[PDB]
Design a protein around this ligand. Structure first.
Ligand SMILES: O=[N+]([O-])c1cc(N2[C@@H]3CC[C@H]2COC3)ccc1NCc1ccc(CN2C[C@H](O)[C@@H](O)[C@H](O)[C@H]2CO)cc1
Length: 765
C-alpha cells in the first residue's frame, strides 16, 4: 500500500507551474523534459520592446504587484499580475486534468486587460516559448494553411520516454490583431500568429530571452539588407513580428501581436489519456478548482477571533496561495568545496582569516546533477530552496496537504551526502545560478542551518498518534504508510543528528569549564567578525572576537529539537538501543543549557566565549537568541527560568513593540547598528515560534498560564495586524517589519515565512 500511494503522489504532482523564477511557465518534476514560459511587452517605438518585455520575476516601480489568488499544486490556480510599465493587468489560470499514465494533462488561459492609463490602441507583443531537453525526443509545429503564419490554432506534436505522445495547442484567442498596409505585408503578411522552430544545444534552452532576441535581430537585419528603411519604415509592431518558419526543433517560439485587450489558451493533451483537452474543459475544471480551494481553506484555515472578517479571509488566501504557489522543481549541478581543507576546522584564534585563505584556493567543483521539489522565500530575489526557511514554509503547507509536505521533506533529505550534510542554499543549475552572484554560489560541507524541518516532522507524528482530497491525507489516514515513510527517513534523521555533533562541536574539555555533561556544547561553523550566516540570524550580535571557545545557545536548542523528534519517531519504530541514547543526551542538554548558557545576573540564556585570560565568559545580547530554549519547546512550564524569559518578552523597554517582538533589545548596545538586519526589526518566523510556545503554556495547569494568555492574545494580534496592514496598503508580504513604525522593509514578495501569519490567525495549535 506504501508503494501504491507513492505511485499515486508521483502521478498527482508530476505537472505544475513549477518555475516560480518567471511570471508564468510550466515544467514537470523531470530534469530533462518539456518546459514552457510566457513573455509580454508593449511596443510603442522601434527600440522600446527590449526594455518593456517581461519573463523572469522582478520587483521595481515598473510592477505594482503579482501573485496567486488561489493555488493547489495538484489542481492549479489563478495568478494576477499588475504591470504599470506595460499598462496591463494579466491573469494566468492554470489547471491539471488527471488521466493516462504520464502524469495527466493541463491547460492555461492568459488574459491581458489594458488598465485605464494605457492607450486604448496599445500594441502588446506576447510570446509562448517552448523547449524540450533529451536525446531521444521530438517536438514539431504542424504547419499553417496560410503562407505568412496562422489564422487559427498552433499545434505542436511531440514525444519523449518521460511524457509519451502529447500535443500542445496555442489557441487563436480573442482580441484584435493589427494589420499592416506596408509593402512588407507582400513578404511577411499584414499580421498573424507566427512560429519559429529552432535547435540549440540542450544546456542553453532555458536562456529564452537571449534566444528570442537573436531571432528578432535576425529579422531586423533582413529588413536592412532587403532595402526596407526610414524613407518608408514598417510600423514597429511588424518590425518585431518574426518571419513564420515552423518545423522540427527543441525550441518553439509562438508569437502573437494584440491591439487592446487579449486572451488565449494553452492546451496540453497527454495522448495516453482519453480525448484531447479543449478550451471548454479549461473553463469547467478552473471553476471547479476555485470551489475546492474555497471549501478546503475554510476547513484547514478557519480564522479565529478577531480575524474571522472577510477582509482577513482575503488576506489569508493571499498569504497562503503565494507561499504554496512558490513551489518549484529545480534540476542540475550544485557548486561545492569538497577540498575539506584543514582551515575549515576553525580550531585557531583568527580561524576566519585561515578560512578566507582556503576559499581563495577555489577548489569548488560542480557536482550532481541533483533534483529538488521545494517552496521558496521570494520569486523575485530568492527563487530557490533554503534549508531552515523550508521548516517554516511547510508548517502551513502540512496543514493544507501533509502528503505534499512529506514529499518535499523527502526531496530535501535525498540531497544528504555520505557524512549527513545538506547544503543550506540549493542553487541547482545554470538557470538557478543566473540569479545568484558568483560570491554566494559555492556551498561548504561544514556550513549547517537550523533543522526546522524536524518541526514539520514533529507535527506529522502528533497527527499520526491522534481523490485529491484522499491523497492529501493518505499518510496519516493509513497508519502503516505513515510509519514506512518514517522508517525510510529515520536513518537520515539520525545521520543528520550525528553530523551536527561531529562538525558543530563546542570545546568544554580544553578550558576552565565545569558542567553536568562534557559532551553537550555546540558552536556554529562558518562565522566571520560581524556575521554567523549558518545560524540563520545573519548579523545578530555574537561574542567578539569570534573564538573556538564560543558556545552558541540557539545551536544547542536546535539539537534539543532534533533529539525530542528522534525519541518520538524512534519509539514508533522500536529503536530501543537508540531511544535510551537520546533520553540520556536530552537530560544532558537540559542541564548543560543552564550550566553553560543560563545567566542569573541578566535573567536570560546567553552565548559563551573564552576571555583574554582563558576563563568561560557569558556574553548576553537581549533578543531572539536569549529566548531560544523557550522558542524550541525545551523548558518545563513551571520553570523559574521560563518566568524571567516571559518578563523579558513582555517588557516594552527591551523586546516588546506594538508591531511584535524585536530581533534585539533597545537596551542592548548593538540595537539598530551596522546593517541592522537582525539587530532591531520584527521577524515573523521567530515571532511565530514564541506565539506557538505561549499558547502551549496558556492551555495547561501552571504558575505562568495567565501571563502567557495575555502575551499570546496580544502578540498574535500585533503580528497579524502588522502583516495585514502592510498587505492592505502595499500589496506585499515583507521579509521583516520596522519596530518603530510597523512598516514592511527589505525585500517584497517574501512568501516566504511571513505567510506563517495564516496559521497564527487559524490557531488551535
Ligand atoms: O548578499 N546579497 O546582497 C545578495 C544579493 C543578491 N542579489 C541578486 C542579485 C543581486 C542582488 C541583488 O538581487 C538579486 C542575491 C543574494 C544575496 N545573498 C544574501 C542573502 C541570501 C538569502 C537571503 C534570504 N534569507 C535571509 C535570511 O536571513 C536567512 O535566514 C534566510 O535563510 C534567507 C533565505 O531566504 C537574504 C540575503
Amino acid at each position: 500500500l506504501h508503494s501504491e500511494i507513492g505511485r499515486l503522489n508521483n502521478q498527482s504532482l508530476l505537472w505544475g507551474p513549477y518555475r516560480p523564477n518567471i511570471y508564468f511557465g510550466t515544467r514537470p518534476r523531470i530534469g530533462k523534459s518539456l518546459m514552457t514560459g510566457l513573455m509580454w511587452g508593449k511596443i510603442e517605438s522601434y527600440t522600446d520592446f527590449q526594455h518593456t518585455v517581461r519573463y523572469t520575476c522582478e520587483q521595481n516601480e515598473g510592477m505594482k504587484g503579482y501573485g496567486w489568488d488561489e493555488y493547489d499544486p495538484r489542481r492549479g490556480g489563478i495568478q494576477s499580475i499588475h504591470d504599470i510599465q506595460n499598462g496591463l493587468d494579466i491573469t494566468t489560470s492554470f489547471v491539471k486534468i488527471p488521466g493516462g499514465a504520464h502524469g495527466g494533462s493541463w491547460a492555461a488561459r492568459i488574459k491581458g486587460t489594458l488598465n485605464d492609463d494605457a492607450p486604448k490602441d496599445q500594441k502588446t507583443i506576447v510570446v509562448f516559448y517552448v523547449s524540450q531537453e533529451g536525446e531521444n525526443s521530438e517536438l514539431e509545429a504542424v504547419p499553417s494553411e496560410n503562407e505568412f503564419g496562422y489564422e487559427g490554432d498552433v499545434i505542436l506534436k511531440g514525444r519523449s520516454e518521460a511524457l509519451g505522445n502529447y500535443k500542445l495547442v496555442v489557441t487563436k484567442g480573442k482580441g484584435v490583431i493589427p494589420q499592416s498596409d506596408h509593402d512588407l505585408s507582400r513578404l511577411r503578411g499584414p499580421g498573424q500568429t507566427v512560429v519559429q522552430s529552432l535547435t540549440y544545444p540542450d544546456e542553453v534552452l532555458w536562456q529564452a530571452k537571449p534566444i528570442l532576441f537573436q531571432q528578432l535581430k535576425a529579422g531586423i537585419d533582413w529588413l536592412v539588407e532587403n532595402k526596407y528603411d526610414v524613407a518608408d519604415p514598417p510600423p514597429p509592431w511588424q518590425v518585431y513580428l518574426l518571419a513564420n518558419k515552423p518545423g522540427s526543433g527543441n525550441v518553439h517560439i509562438v508569437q502573437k501581436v494584440f491591439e487592446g485587450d487579449f486572451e488565449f489558451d494553452i492546451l496540453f493533451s497527454s495522448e495516453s489519456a482519453g480525448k484531447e483537452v479543449t478550451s471548454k474543459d479549461l473553463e469547467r475544471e478552473v471553476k471547479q478548482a476555485t470551489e475546492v480551494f474555497g471549501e478546503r481553506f475554510a476547513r484547514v484555515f478557519d480564522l479565529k477571533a478577531p480575524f474571522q472578517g472577510d477582509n482577513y479571509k482575503k488576506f489569508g488566501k493571499s498569504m497562503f496561495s503565494n507561499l504554496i504557489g512558490g513551489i518549484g522543481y529545480f534540476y542540475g549541478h550544485s557548486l561545492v568545496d569538497r577540498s575539506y581543507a584543514p582551515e575549515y576546522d576553525e580550531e585557531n584564534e583568527g580561524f576566519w582569516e585561515d578560512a578566507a585563505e582556503a576559499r581563495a584556493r577555489h577548489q569548488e567543483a560542480l557536482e550532481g546533477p541533483y533534483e529538488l521539489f521545494t517552496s521558496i522565500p521570494s520569486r523575485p530575489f530568492f527563487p530557490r530552496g533554503f534549508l531552515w526557511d523550508e521548516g517554516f514554509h511547510l508548517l502551513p503547507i502540512a496543514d493544507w496537504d501533509i502528503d505534499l509536505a512529506l514529499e518535499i521533506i523527502k526531496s530535501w533529505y535525498n540531497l544528504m551526502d555520505e557524512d549527513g550534510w545538506i547544503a543550506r542554499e540549493q542553487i541547482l543549475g545554470a538557470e538557478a545560478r543566473s540569479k545568484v552572484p558568483k560570491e554566494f554560489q559555492t556551498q561548504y560541507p561544514h556550513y549547517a542551518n537550523p533543522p526546522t524541518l524536524f518541526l514539520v516532522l514533529d507535527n506529522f507524528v502528533e497527527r499520526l498518534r491522534k481523490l485529491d482530497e484522499t491523497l492529501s491525507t493518505a499518510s496519516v489516514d493509513n497508519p502503516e504508510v505513515g510509519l514506512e515513510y518514517l522508517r525510510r527517513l529515520y536513518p537520515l534523521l539520525r545521520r543528520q543528528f550525528d553530523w551536527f555533533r561531529k562538525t558543530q562541536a563546542g570545546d568544554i574539555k580544553s578550558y576552565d569549564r565545569e558542567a553536568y555533561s562534557t559532551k553537550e556544547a555546540y558552536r556554529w561553523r562558518g562565522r566571520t567578525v560581524s556575521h554567523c550566516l549558518t545560524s540563520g540570524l545573519d548579523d545578530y550580535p555574537r561574542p567578539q572576537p569570534p573564538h573556538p571557545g564560543e558556545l552558541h545557545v540557539d545551536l544547542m536548542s536546535w539539537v534539543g529539537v532534533m533529539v525530542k523528534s528522534l525519541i518520538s519517531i524512534g519509539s514508533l519504530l522500536g529503536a530501543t538501543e537508540d531511544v535510551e541514547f537520546y533520553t540520556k543526551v536530552l537530560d544532558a542538554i537540559e542541564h548543560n543549557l543552564d550550566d553553560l548558557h543560563w545567566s542569573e545576573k541578566e535573567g536570560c540564556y546567553c552565548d559563551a566565549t573564552i576571555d583574554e585570560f582563558e576563563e568561560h565568559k557569558l556574553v548576553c545580547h537581549k533578543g531572539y537568541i536569549s529566548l531560544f530554549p523557550f522558542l524550541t519547546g525545551l523548558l518545563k512550564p513551571d520553570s523559574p527560568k521560563l518566568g524571567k524569559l516571559l518578563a523579558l518578552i513582555g517588557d516594552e523597554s527591551e523586546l516588546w513593540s506594538p508591531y511584535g517582538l524585536r530581533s534585539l533589545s533597545k537596551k542592548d548596545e548593538f540595537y539598530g547598528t551596522a546593517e541592522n538586519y537582525w539587530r532591531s526589526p520584527v521577524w515573523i518566523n521567530i515571532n511565530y515560534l514564541a506565539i506557538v510556545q505561549l499558547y502551549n503554556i496558556a492551555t495547561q495547569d501552571g504558575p505562568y498560564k495567565e501571563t502567557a494568555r495575555d502575551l499570546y492574545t496580544r502578540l498574535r494580534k500585533n503580528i497579524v495586524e502588522t502583516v495585514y496592514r502592510n498587505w492592505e496598503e502595499t500589496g506585499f508580504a515583507w521579509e521583516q517589519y520596522n519596530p518603530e513604525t510597523g512598516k514592511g522593509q527589505r525585500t517584497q514578495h517574501f512568501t516566504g515565512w511571513t505567510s506563517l501569519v495564516v496559521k497564527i490567525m487559524s490557531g488551535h495549535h
